[PDB]
Amino acid sequence: IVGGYTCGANTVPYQVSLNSGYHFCGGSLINSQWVVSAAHCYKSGIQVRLGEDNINVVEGNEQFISASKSIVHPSYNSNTLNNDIMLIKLKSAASLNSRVASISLPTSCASAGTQCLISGWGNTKSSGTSYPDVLKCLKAPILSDSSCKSAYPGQITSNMFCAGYLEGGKDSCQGDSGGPVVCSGKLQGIVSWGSGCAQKNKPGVYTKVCNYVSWIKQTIASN
Ligand SMILES: [Ca+2]
């Protein structure tokens, strides 16, 4: 996250870290046994880390649970990033409380102008690299589809939205991928892609979760 603030320990209780020996992506806990992330975060051998603030220090609220199954969306296209969404089933159910909690799926899509919370452990610089150990947060609005398509001609599908600031300076970045965009207490987006981070006229692009609720519910019900 570039241009954000330190969230505070366990203030984003649905935020997960995906770990394969090191943090490589975020995700969101949607019930006691399932995490949603980006398809471009797929790899084998994922451990899901819940209850994290500092990802390099054991602070006492962590739960580390291995993945038993990963399901990339059937229509994911790695070249265009269309349908950039993946479900991960945990080997055992997480223990839910105030510091580890699920986030609700949306019943309707959010409109442009809605303010959302984006969070992650990704790079905090737009030029150069500095990775934080504690969770960073950013409040950002959903942008109109016309502004999003004007920023990224020929690249925005109906399964994507832009959020952030056309003036630059505040954005998600490398290592935030797969993490949550939460608006009015519902998961509306997944950190997906962008051209660089926090550049002028290049806001972040996010997977539009409301288009996937039927697929998520049907998949969880049968796996
Ligand atoms: Ca920790």
Curated annotation (Swiss-Prot):
Report the superkingdom from the record: Eukaryota
- Record carries keyword Disulfide bond: yes
Question: InterPro entries, from UniProt?
Answer: Peptidase_S1_PA, Peptidase_S1_PA_chymotrypsin, Peptidase_S1A, Serine_Proteases_S1, Trypsin_dom, TRYPSIN_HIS, TRYPSIN_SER
Please list the residues that bind Ca(2+).
52, 54, 57, 62
E.C. number = 3.4.21.4
| Broad class of the protein's primary localization | secreted
Could you tell me what this protein is called?
A: Serine protease 1
Source organism phylogeny: Eukaryota, Metazoa, Chordata, Craniata, Vertebrata
What gene, per UniProt, encodes this protein? PRSS1
